[PDB]
Amino acid sequence: GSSGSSGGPKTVTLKRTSQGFGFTLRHFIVYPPESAIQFSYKDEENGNRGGKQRNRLEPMDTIFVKQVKEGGPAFEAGLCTGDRIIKVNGESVIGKTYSQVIALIQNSDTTLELSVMPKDSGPSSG
Q: What are phi and psi of 100, to 5 degrees?
A: -90, -60
Q: Report how far residue 74's alpha carbon sits from residue 69's, in angstroms, rounded to the nearest whole number.
A: 7
Q: Which CATH architecture has domain 1-126?
A: Roll (2.30)
Q: Report how far residue 84's alpha carbon sits from residue 60's, in angstroms, rounded to the nearest whole number.
A: 13
Residues 6+ apart with CB under 8 A from 6: none
Residues 6+ apart with CB under 8 A from 10: 86, 115, 116, 117, 118
What is the rounded radius of gyration, in angstroms, for the C-alpha atoms of the chain? 18
Query: Would you tell me how many other CB atoms lie within 10 Å of the CB of residue 13?
Result: 14
Residues 6+ apart with CB under 8 A from 85: 25, 62, 63, 64, 65, 93, 101, 114, 115, 116
Domains of the chain, residue spans: 1-126
